[PDB]
Write a protein that binds this ligand. Structure first.
Ligand SMILES: Nc1ncnc2c1ncn2[C@@H]1O[C@H](CSCC[C@H](N)C(=O)O)[C@@H](O)[C@H]1O
Ligand SMILES: Nc1ncnc2c1ncn2[C@@H]1O[C@H](CSCC[C@H](N)C(=O)O)[C@@H](O)[C@H]1O
Lengths: 602, 617
């Protein structure tokens, strides 16, 4: 509901200003804890021996107020990266002094502006302050979307976009992507391109500063922003960031912000990052199935597949004399079986149903429909499809053992064991599925994986295992290439699910390789498909999240380079895992060798 | 003694071939454990159901003979990186078969040749076999210094650069994550690459060198003789103490195989005498230790003995006192002027004696104060005191920063210099000892300056990477300096002056907190692994000591260089610039360094707040 704050240059009376901005509709206040003009000496007499208080004490406000209402502001005269040695020293002392005072008050946030590209010494002092005890203080980095020198007016006759991004990137990289360090963007009269904007939005923005001078005066003397500025506020709305109003009153600009909200264009697993589920190794929970059974697209296509499958193997003269044997391999809690029954009667054709399941907890749900809805036509079998002896061969087998990478849930291994009781002319649904790989760049997802270090194991094990991610959390560097492919029923001379391939991609830009995004598509029956590939309008695009294969050493690359990735799929009879390595432009180490970090049961 | 082996193409009778090559002078035999022509099927009948043994039994030799005399050879028909799926799948099964059997025999080493650039699938199969328990078997990767296509005779009309095979080995070892069980077995051809290329080869863990019988020239007497080009390569291999392997038929000369071994023994006893080497020998060659802290810790007597082994430091310091005396007391004050000299950090003696003899050489009278904080060293100091020196030398036990001198000094002499100059906290010690120095007093050394240079060393990096200790930050090893050697790394640019300290420091407010940005231009395509640290110092006027790379001042063998590693190695192109931010911090209780790379790629600040490395007091 639009949380807003007020940025002031100087406060003559704290108690009065707080109530004044409260009546305006502001939630918090960005104020300096030291007077912005009150410069001080630390080394040279007699200015060093200056008597009196350094600033107003902590007893002006309650502890509750300092922790909720006040956002501290660093003095602007402090320049920790000044080329002047004396000034650099003084700033270092002043930097530590104000950082320590902000933590003493228990401030929730502290503003530190970046006014140049070189903020090396600042980052050094900041991460030092964070490491030395003091905590629970978020650090908002005031960084303008455009440099002040790029927004000035062309008034100098002898001196007539990616700039400020380097300011933030270099500082954050130097600070090793510390969690206590967020971003506070400042919006100028001119905005960067749409792509650059989206890149800023990927950064942990906690506040957005709105200068009072970027607002236009309407016909009735009311503040108004351009559509260019408006679209940015719309993107900032769905990030739930706070807005800070800075500048002179010449103050209910919040009305226009609420106006832009109440009437905002319509559209939370976006941050979500965990390891892929293993239905074959683990008995899923009822709450887990419900998520899978919450997508109608998967239900529709699986119904349309069985629909067309019957129509292509039994004519009208056998419409009631031919009874097909349909087996639901991995029935789950019902939906797949009900989809077949809703497909058989849709185009009148008689079927004999066998519903198998290894999960006993799901069998109970299956045997609920068995004696309340389905009947005797649907036979319930409790066990593994690879060890169960069927007393009758099947015309059709329907299964949904597909993961984010297609075969990562060991669909091939399962269907290969259930292939023996399939008729010679039998049709398997799905018929085939293909995994895809695409080189990506995500400093966000990398540091997110980097923080997944667990004790009592390999400190780098988190980099040698796949993760289920989201599309917008990374920038795809090249179009996905087909990785592995499995088709059922497998009429190969011998069934070997061990695979290997070398995929190459062309680097068009200058970026950093952080890993590989994994997608997949499948063919249930002819014409009926399910796909999650990016550039594909095929249905099922919201049925699976993309997978991510991280890399240990991020690879900075120039444009004109090539990325060859070696990818293995291994099967030692007990476990199935993936091994991967980069061989261009530089050779990395083979990730997850012998499944030392990641394996999939059976 | 030169250990050597024999590479055979095939063996009919094993017991016969062993005794045959044993009397030739060999110490081991490089033979295949499976017949090189015995290509086998695994996935298709009727060839799949092949009866009989796959190869000869293990009962032919004892365990002792298998463990010490035999180096297994992988079959050449096994091509696990063929673009044909049927060939690859067959080779993969064949690869695992011979590997598991070689480990079953307890073989000390196993030969696997690299014949192309793409050995990705080979790496996967190899590091697997190492990880499934079977170890203790060294893996000799046979890689020729020159590609077979580059050594063939130009005999084709329609089909008429030397770092080609280096990529074969480098890509393979990198894919194998620089595994400890994987070594290099170079194969020497008729043509040799550049000397710098060779020097890069020798940096790798070479365990063996293959000497074909076809590279030997037949002398006018009929004896096998190597060319002078090859002889220099053999000489370099001698000091690496690698083993030599003779491959091919001895019927290229009029003599037998033993003559090839006698020639190598001949070159060994006629090999050039090593100097500019042997300092480190034998050796501090792979020296990777943390810098000693004589201030936070009391050195052992053995440790002092090492520092006192360099006559250069003794001479230069003696020369410094020599010149300093003559400059501050004239000839007419040859006996009426007694110079008050103080040896701050006397150690076991040397600096005190070097000052006494410098007084006799200059014919000047000095009153000596020998101060030391190490109680154990003071015991040694009071030995010289009550046997040799006398009452002219006053031995003081304590810290120079806390000691209250009852008499100001004309000259203070100290040797608190580390590999990086100030890494042993020489400034802090002298600053706290500056007060009892006269207003016109001279400090030895008068000044010193540290230097930094961007380097490349996959060798040193992986050594640091293995320095992960339990119960601490798993990346802490990359955030601390190491004392290393020059030949273990390749400098990418000339070193720049880092921090400078002069004594006595006459600044207004004495601060040892330092910061600088050093920029270097890259002229090659290489990988940044860290920064080398050197230092130079001025004892007295014109009398200096330095360990800087291209320094003409003495002291090049007085200190090993230091290394500041990096967490994420940076692959760089030529034309790129390398800006490094370097900090020296002093919080009153600890002193440490913080460094970060801001070009071409912006890294993170290493050792922030001295979380991984500090220096006492
Ligand atoms: N070998 C086997 N035998 C019997 N049932 C199996 C099996 N392997 C898997 N299953 C069943 O098949 C079901 C797979 S549910 C898979 C959901 C899918 N990955 C999605 O994201 O939508 C599970 O309920 C499991 O119990
Ligand atoms: N503050 C202090 N007070 C007194 N003695 C000190 C001191 N700091 C160091 N010393 C002494 O000075 C000696 C320095 S030995 C240094 C060896 C030199 N870095 C080299 O590698 O060649 C030590 O024996 C130590 O005991």
């Amino acid at each position: 509901r639009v949380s807003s704050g007020r940025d002031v240059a100087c406060v003559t009376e704290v108690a009065d200003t707080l109530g004044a901005m409260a009546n305006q509709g502001f939630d918090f206040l960005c104020m300096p804890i030291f007077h912005p003009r009150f410069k001080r000496e630390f080394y040279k007499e007699p200015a060093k021996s200056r008597p009196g208080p350094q600033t107003r004490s902590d007893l002006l406000l309650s502890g509750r107020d300092w922790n909720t209402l006040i956002v501290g502001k660093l003095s602007d005269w402090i320049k920790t990266d000044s080329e002047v040695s004396r000034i650099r020293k003084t700033s270092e002392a002043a930097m530590q002094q104000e950082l320590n005072f902000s933590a003493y008050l228990g401030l929730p946030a502290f503003l530190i502006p970046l006014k140049q590209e070189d903020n090396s010494n600042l980052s050094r002092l900041l991460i030092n302050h964070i490491h030395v005890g003091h905590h629970s203080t978020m650090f908002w980095m005031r960084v303008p979307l455009m440099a002040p020198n790029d927004l000035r007016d062309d008034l100098i006759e002898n001196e007539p976009e990616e700039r400020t991004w380097i300011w933030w990137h270099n500082f954050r990289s130097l600070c090793d992507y510390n969690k206590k360090i967020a971003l506070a963007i400042e919006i100028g009269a001119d905005l960067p391109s749409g792509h650059v904007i989206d890149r800023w939005l990927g950064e942990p923005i906690k506040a957005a500063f709105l200068p009072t001078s970027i607002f236009l005066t309407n016909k009735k003397g009311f503040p108004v922003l351009t559509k260019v500025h408006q679209r940015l506020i719309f993107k900032l709305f769905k990030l739930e960031v706070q807005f800070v109003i800075s500048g002179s009153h010449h103050c209910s600009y919040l009305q226009y912000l609420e106006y832009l909200s109440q009437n905002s264009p319509p559209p939370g697993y976006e941050d979500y990052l965990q390891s892929p589920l293993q239905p074959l190794m683990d008995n899923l929970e009822s709450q887990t199935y419900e998520v899978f059974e919450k997508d109608p697209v998967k239900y529709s296509q699986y119904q349309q597949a069985v629909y067309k499958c019957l129509l292509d193997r039994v004519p009208e003269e056998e419409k009631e004399t031919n009874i097909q044997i349909l087996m639901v391999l991995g029935a789950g809690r019902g939906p797949l079986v009900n989809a077949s029954l809703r497909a058989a009667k849709q185009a009148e054709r008689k079927i004999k149903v066998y519903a198998v399941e290894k999960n006993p907890n799901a069998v109970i749900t299956l045997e609920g429909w068995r004696y309340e809805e389905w009947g005797s036509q649907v036979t319930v079998v409790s066990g593994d499809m690879r060890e169960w002896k069927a007393p009758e061969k099947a015309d059709i087998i329907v299964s949904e053992l597909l993961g984010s990478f297609g075969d990562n849930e060991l669909s091939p291994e399962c269907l290969d064991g259930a292939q023996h009781f399939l008729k010679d002319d039998g049709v398997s649904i799905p018929g085939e599925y293909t995994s895809y790989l695409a080189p990506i760049s995500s400093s966000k997802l990398y540091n997110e994986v980097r923080a997944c270090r667990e004790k009592d194991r390999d400190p780098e094990a988190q980099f040698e295992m796949p993760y289920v991610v989201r599309l917008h959390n990374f920038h795809q560097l090249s179009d996905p290439l087909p990785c592995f492919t499995f088709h059922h029923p497998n009429k190969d001379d011998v069934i070997d699910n061990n695979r290997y391939c070398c995929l190459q991609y062309r680097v068009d830009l200058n970026t950093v390789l952080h890993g590989f995004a994994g997608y997949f598509n499948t063919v249930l029956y002819k014409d009926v498909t399910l796909s999650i590939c990016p550039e594909s309008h095929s249905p099922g695009m919201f049925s699976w999240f993309p997978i991510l294969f991280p890399i240990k050493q991020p690879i900075p690359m120039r444009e004109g380079d090539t990325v060859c990735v070696r990818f293995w799929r291994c099967n030692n009879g007990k476990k199935v895992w993936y091994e991967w390595a980069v061989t261009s432009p530089v050779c990395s180490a083979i990730h997850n060798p012998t499944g030392r970090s990641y394996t999939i049961g059976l």
